[PDB]
Amino acid sequence: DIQMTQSPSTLSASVGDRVTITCRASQTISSWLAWYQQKSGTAPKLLIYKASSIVSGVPSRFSGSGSGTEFTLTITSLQPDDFATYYCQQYNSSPETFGQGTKVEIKRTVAAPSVFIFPPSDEQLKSGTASVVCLLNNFYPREAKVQWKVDNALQSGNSQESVTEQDSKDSTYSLSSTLTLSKADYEKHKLYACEVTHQGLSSPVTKSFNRGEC
Amino acid sequence: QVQLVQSGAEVKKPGSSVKVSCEASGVTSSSYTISWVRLAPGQGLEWMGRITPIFDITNYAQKFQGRVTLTADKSTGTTYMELSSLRSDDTAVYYCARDKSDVVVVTSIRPAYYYGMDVWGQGTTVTVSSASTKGPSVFPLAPSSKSTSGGTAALGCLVKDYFPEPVTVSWNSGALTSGVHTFPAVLQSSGLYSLSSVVTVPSSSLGTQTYICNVNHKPSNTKVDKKVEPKSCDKT
Numbered sequence A: 001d002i003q004m005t006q007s008p009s010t011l012s013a014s015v016g017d018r019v020t021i022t023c024r025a026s027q028t029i030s031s032w033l034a035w036y037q038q039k040s041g042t043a044p045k046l047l048i049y050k051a052s053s054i055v056s057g058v059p060s061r062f063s064g065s066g067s068g069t070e071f072t073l074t075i076t077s078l079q080p081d082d083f084a085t086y087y088c089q090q091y092n093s094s095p096e097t098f099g100q101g102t103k104v105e106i107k108r109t110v111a112a113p114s115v116f117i118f119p120p121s122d123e124q125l126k127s128g129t130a131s132v133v134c135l136l137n138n139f140y141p142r143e144a145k146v147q148w149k150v151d152n153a154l155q156s157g158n159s160q161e162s163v164t165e166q167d168s169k170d171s172t173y174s175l176s177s178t179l180t181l182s183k184a185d186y187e188k189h190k191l192y193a194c195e196v197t198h199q200g201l202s203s204p205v206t207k208s209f210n211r212g213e214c
Numbered sequence B: 001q002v003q004l005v006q007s008g009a010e011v012k013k014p015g016s017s018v019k020v021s022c023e024a025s026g027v028t029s030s031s032y033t034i035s036w037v038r039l040a041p042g043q044g045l046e047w048m049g050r051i052t053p054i055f056d057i058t059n060y061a062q063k064f065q066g067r068v069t070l071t072a073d074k075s076t077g078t079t080y081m082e083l084s085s086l087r088s089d090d091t092a093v094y095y096c097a098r099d100k101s102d103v104v105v106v107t108s109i110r111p112a113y114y115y116g117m118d119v120w121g122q123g124t125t126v127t128v129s130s131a132s133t134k135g136p137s138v139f140p141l142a143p144s145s146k147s148t149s150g151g152t153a154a155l156g157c158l159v160k161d162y163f164p165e166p167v168t169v170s171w172n173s174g175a176l177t178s179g180v181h182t183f184p185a186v187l188q189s190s191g192l193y194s195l196s197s198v199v200t201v202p203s204s205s206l207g208t209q210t211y212i213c214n215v216n217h218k219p220s221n222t223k224v225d226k227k228v229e230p231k232s233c234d235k236t
Helices: none
Strands: A004-007 A010-013 A019-025 A033-038 A045-049 A062-067 A070-075 A085-090 A102-106 A114-118 A129-139 A145-149 A173-182 A191-197 A205-210 B004-006 B010-012 B018-024 B034-040 B044-052 B068-073 B078-083 B092-101 B114-120 B125-128 B137-141 B152-162 B168-171 B180-182 B193-202 B211-216 B223-228
Touching (some): A004 A085, A010 A019, A019 A085, A019 A102, A045 A062, A085 B044, A114 A191, A114 A205, A129 A191, A129 B137, A129 B152, A145 A173, B004 B092, B018 B092, B044 B068, B078 B092, B137 B223, B152 B223, B193 B211
Parallel strands (some): B010 B125
Antiparallel strands (some): A033 A085, A114 A129, A191 A205, B018 B078, B034 B044, B092 B114, B137 B152, B168 B211, B180 B193
């Protein structure tokens, strides 16, 4: 059984740039390797087979190389629509195994997020459950730690979050963290904070509200 | 111009079986081969099996073997993928693909005559949860002092506790699109989904302009529009 590991697991780059993804097979597979590109709502696209053979319809900028256990996929000049995940597949022995995929994201400037906090609705509160949403708007890199505190007392395990895909116009991310308690435990405290750290932050920005004033 | 058309999405209780179809048209042979590959959240791309309908020859993956069953209907260029003892981690997107060979595949891929999986289906989304179908409770994310930044206010909708995906959100019946962010749903420990949709507008408009989210959960079967209005908060 053959395991395919690629590197890096992810990489950020710019239009125009020279991008190269790497592929290691756990035993020699001669030249029996294919490259696949995949975007979001779409099926994988075949790009390369026999390690270097380009498909009818794949742009000249795409090039493959390698034989044995080390292989390489190379976009020469990057391009608006080349931002995607690339999978390598070995078709030597069965089963066919894929790589873990390499997501290629866009490279923009560092951008500090803009933070917002949202108290529970009047009508969610009628339901026994109380949700508090912290929003981190438009930032880069994708890394951000969101910390809830009540009152100045760190929560953990009540806070799911989610990140937007790399925005099409300004290539920034957005995050939505969501504290969730009962209209009983809520209701036991006054001070709901939401502290945020980023790479483009001088100092950890906090948004907080007093319960029952909101 | 060969094209593969898979069957619609599918929500299945755990333990149940699911059988997705795939309709080739038009390959240049009866001796074509069709692979099945699933896109699974967190573990990547993943080859399941393979069928050459003309001879009904099948080769499954060890990791599945017990549960997969490839079949064909030669008269109608359709194959079928049946995954059976469905666990919650079979929740994934299921693709069918052409295996392009110069020679009929009767066991392994014969690598010197392979050209890759060159044509795929759209995919079929298969969700495996104990959960039962349900519309969401839509709550307002109210704009206020605490949702403000230098001229700009943020407001939104909380689409809470539904099943299954998907739900859609527009703003003011689609009239308002610039600056909107709708986050990927999230799977709560209740087995029910929950997303947030959010907008940034200039603060001075909260008084003159009316803001509404339009929530359509087509499965079951709510259409709901909530009016998001400004709330009062502590100035300090």
